[PDB]
Amino acid sequence: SHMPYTIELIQPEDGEAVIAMLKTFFFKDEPLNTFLDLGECKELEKYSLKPLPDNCSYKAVNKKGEIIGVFLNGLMRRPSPDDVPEKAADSCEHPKFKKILSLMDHVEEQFNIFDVYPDEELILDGKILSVDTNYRGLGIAGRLTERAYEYMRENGINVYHVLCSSHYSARVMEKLGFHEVFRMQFADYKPQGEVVFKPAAPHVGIQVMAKEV
Numbered sequence: 001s002h003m004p005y006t007i008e009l010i011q012p013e014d015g016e017a018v019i020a021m022l023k024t025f026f027f028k029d030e031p032l033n034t035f036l037d038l039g040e041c042k043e044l045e046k047y048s049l050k051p052l053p054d055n056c057s058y059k060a061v062n063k064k065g066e067i068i069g070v071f072l073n074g075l076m077r078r079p080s081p082d083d084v085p086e087k088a089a090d091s092c093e094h095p096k097f098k099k100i101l102s103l104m105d106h107v108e109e110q111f112n113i114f115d116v117y118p119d120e121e122l123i124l125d126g127k128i129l130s131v132d133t134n135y136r137g138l139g140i141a142g143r144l145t146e147r148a149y150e151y152m153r154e155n156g157i158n159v160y161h162v163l164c165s166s167h168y169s170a171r172v173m174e175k176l177g178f179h180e181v182f183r184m185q186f187a188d189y190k191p192q193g194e195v196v197f198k199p200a201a202p203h204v205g206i207q208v209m210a211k212e213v
């Protein structure tokens with residue numbers, strides 16, 4: 001049997017298994033990744049492992065011990081009064097991944113989640129969410145998300161922030177009790193005067209989603 005599954009804290013020694021799962025699914029089937037045909041992307045591998053030592057990322061593991069879902073989260077801190085805002089895309093050599101990092105930089109230049117919550121110093125950031133295709137539609141995304149609420153409660157974190165790359169994923173977060181705090185249509189994202197991302201019409205654009213727990 002493959003069911004039931006558990007939800008467990010991701011450990012540093014899980015890095016290779018996490019990357020293997022993401023390469024099978026997220027790298028190929030997150031909408032922007034598939035639109036670009038990301039391919040091999042060691043920089044996304046490194047990006048995905050970065051939040052693990054924050055000790056608040058979760059894996060769904062089936063009855064055979066295989067990872068069938070992950071939600072990789074990191075703590076984000078309010079920029080210091082003397083902050084030097086850096087563009088993440090400036091340190092990326094992979095051209096396709098750079099386009100995604102540039103989109104993230106653009107969102108952050110237009111919208112600062114910390115402006116919404118002036119009293120908060122630390123906010124949980126949901127960075128990478130992926131569920132194995134054969135296990136989709138079972139509520140695993142919600143159970144991964146709910147495990148983060150436990151971490152938030154234990155540590156007095158009030159806000160969970162998730163940048164969603166498609167209305168499809170934003171709708172999942174809405175079902176889980178998140179609400180939109182910022183949006184941008186792909187048709188309106190023209191950093192150098194021209195559209196960069198043209199996925200299918202139902203995706204629409206990015207929505208930053210937030211929940212206060």
Ligand SMILES: CC(=O)SCCNC(=O)CCNC(=O)[C@H](O)C(C)(C)COP(=O)(O)OP(=O)(O)OC[C@H]1O[C@@H](n2cnc3c(N)ncnc32)[C@H](O)[C@@H]1OP(=O)(O)O
Pocket residue numbers: 025026029030031126127128129130131132133135136137138139140141142162163164165166169172175
């Ligand atoms: C911060 C970020 O990572 S943003 C990018 C988010 N990740 C991606 O886009 C990667 C590709 N997508 C996925 O991995 C998954 O679709 C996820 C993680 C978004 C959702 O995971 P799931 O555990 O399937 O979520 P859930 O069980 O709530 O199903 C969501 C919706 O998918 C639909 N769905 C239903 N059955 C299936 C199925 N077999 N396969 C795919 N979708 C299904 C339903 O519309 C369902 O909503 P509903 O059950 O409330 O009616």
Ligand SMILES: OCCc1c[nH]c2ccccc12
Pocket residue numbers: 030032033044047100127128162163164165
């Ligand atoms: O918040 C953005 C989530 C995301 C969508 N596509 C990606 C590719 C690499 C890393 C993160 C993302």
Ligand SMILES: OCCc1c[nH]c2ccccc12
Pocket residue numbers: 029030031166168169172
């Ligand atoms: O191919 C679309 C992949 C997808 C991304 N987010 C979702 C949410 C629900 C169902 C499918 C998706």
Ligand SMILES: OCCc1c[nH]c2ccccc12
Pocket residue numbers: 166167183184185186203204205206207
């Ligand atoms: O259902 C689509 C709702 C929507 C309106 N404007 C947007 C911009 C980005 C993502 C989604 C939307």
